[PDB]
Amino acid sequence: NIKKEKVLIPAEVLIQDIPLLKTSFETVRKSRKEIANIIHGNDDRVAVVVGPCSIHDPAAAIEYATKLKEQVKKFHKDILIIMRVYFEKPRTTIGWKGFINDPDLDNSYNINKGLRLARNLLSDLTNMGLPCATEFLDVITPQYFAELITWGAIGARTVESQVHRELASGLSASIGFKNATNGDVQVAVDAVKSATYPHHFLSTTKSGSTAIFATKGNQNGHVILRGGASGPNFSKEHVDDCIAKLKKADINTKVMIDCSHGNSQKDHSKQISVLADICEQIKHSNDIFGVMIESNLVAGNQDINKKPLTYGQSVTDKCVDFEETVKMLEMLAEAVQVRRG
Amino acid sequence: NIKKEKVLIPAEVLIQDIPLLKTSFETVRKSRKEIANIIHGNDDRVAVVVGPCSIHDPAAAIEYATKLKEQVKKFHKDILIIMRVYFEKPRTTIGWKGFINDPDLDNSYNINKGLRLARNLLSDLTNMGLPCATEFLDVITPQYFAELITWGAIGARTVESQVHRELASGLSASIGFKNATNGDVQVAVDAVKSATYPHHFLSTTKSGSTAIFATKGNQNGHVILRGGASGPNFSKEHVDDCIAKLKKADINTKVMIDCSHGNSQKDHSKQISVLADICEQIKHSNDIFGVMIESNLVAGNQDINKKPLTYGQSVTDKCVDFEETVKMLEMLAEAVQVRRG
Ligand SMILES: [Ca+2]
Ligand SMILES: [Ca+2]
Ligand SMILES: [Mn+2]
Ligand SMILES: [Mn+2]
């Protein structure tokens, strides 16, 4: 059932072509220490992973990033802003997989081009001084850009996946694990726990070879609450339960809450009301360390097959516009100010 | 968080060392056609995937196989027997991963040895004329033995995993997809559906390189019902629902039922009573095509750290002994005889 084996250019080559720049190196090094301390509760700033549902237009991503970088100096005493740079969209069965799989959006499937532009985008963003977030999807793609990532995620669909826990245990970035699509938080706690251990597993090298990897474990793992079939899990009730589950596993990292996806129930205009509940919580407890917001230049979404596409509007999930995103940052920064004694 | 990159020997080399023998080739070719026809309903024999929970002793596996091969001629008009040769055990967080990860059972993690003995075991079994089943776990291990596999599985924990659906879409073996650990059958139906499509995805070659794979899709995918947090799903009620879900996705393959794991609720002495319900169903409907039984030489299980280990007894999940397995085959063969007009 194999039509064709096609050539893949190893990460080595793209790393030579698109080197780790000094500003990038320093942004990652610094922001990684900063998010680790927030995750463990040693800083009471709140982390905000904010950006487009998925990248389809790198030029639009740069323009978005410019606007975001402008806000950082307003909020940096209260908030750590990390830009969401996602290259894959989950699909129930089929559909556009994302920018890495098909960057030209035309079923040409130019994965080499995808990987090249993905890395180049991450190089550009971090070189502007913006920390970046992405989902770690498999054992091949991360070698192309994992050293440009400050914070990463394991998705709801792979939270029970053994190689994903193993993979996370070897990544340098801090890692959040989403609860299951059905709403189960225990499996995400299990995943965090597993990821703290050393593992031997099969992965790939920068030279494009297969290899055995012995990992050290990742002590900066935490749960992301993102709703599911059980219903939204952003409330105080749900956060306390998650914390209780973590303590049972002897894990002391804090909780991140996704304002979007299952918690907003896919409604982009609900993100701000989920955030309002989270801010009230942030004021009276240090249990929540972070949130995720799905945000873009133009609000809402469109069909990927529309000609011409609206510039700066999501081609996947509905996002809030930037104006609304600034209000949300204001809300979070106030939450932190009131939190502080 | 990487302690060490260690060398992995590419499948190429193990394939040269442990070649596909002629009897093996013919067993796989024939048995694959046979299971495909059963899955699609064109044969009304029932497929039986039967064997140890997981392999830890290849010599004990050969002895088991000999006994199994002896039964085939008794039952082959009614039943297609496929031997279960599993090399991995799911763990909530940590524990012995299985024979590939750590064949010497001592945290030496000699994965190359594991892969070598795994392939050599599969070569031996198929060379005896026994079709074999295994779980397809990742994008690296299958290159070492996928051409010796008649029927494969995607586990409950990876049923929502995108690369696993993609992987299945490129494998030649027939593939069953387990329902989710929570009990959700829809996700397994979704996975079967997705696996019928062509995909472009990142995988690995026999030379041990990374590559893009364009697949054709796999039209021999089906659901495996195996219980979960929802409770056992072996009953008629549950089988009808699964069939209804499949028809909605325009998938016409039939249903396999695991007598063990979630359906027996981990109790090995319940497998036979779950099977009794399934046989009654098999008599009056062609919806169920297959079952899974966890079986070994000695009944029950033991701790992997016992010195000395009991020969022929499971080191993971509890299995029924062979005597009881023969009774179960008798029951299934009778079920089919009554089914037939
Ligand atoms: Ca402790
Ligand atoms: Ca049709
Ligand atoms: Mn999204
Ligand atoms: Mn088992």
Author numbering:
A (entry chain A), B (entry chain A): 14 to 354
Paper text:
Third, we carried out homology modeling and X-ray crystallography to determine the structures of the selected drug targets for subsequent ligand docking. methods, three proteins [3-deoxy-d-arabino-heptulosonate-7-phosphate synthase (aroG), nicotinate-nucleotide pyrophosphorylase (nadC), and d-sedoheptulose 7-phosphate isomerase (lpcA)] were readily crystallized, and their structure was determined using molecular replacement.
We constructed and expressed full-length or slightly shortened recombinant proteins for the remaining targets to optimize protein crystallization without removing any functionally important regions. All structures were prepared as full atomistic models for use in target evaluation and ligand docking. Given computational and experimental limitations on the number of targets and compounds we could screen, we selected a diverse set of 10 candidate targets across a range of metabolic pathways. The success of generating crystal structures against some of these targets was greatly helped by the availability of genomic DNA, express primer service, and robotics to clone, express, and purify the proteins and to screen crystallization conditions. We mitigated these risks by considering multiple (ten) targets. This proved important because only inhibitors for roughly half the metabolic targets (four) affected bacterial growth in vivo.
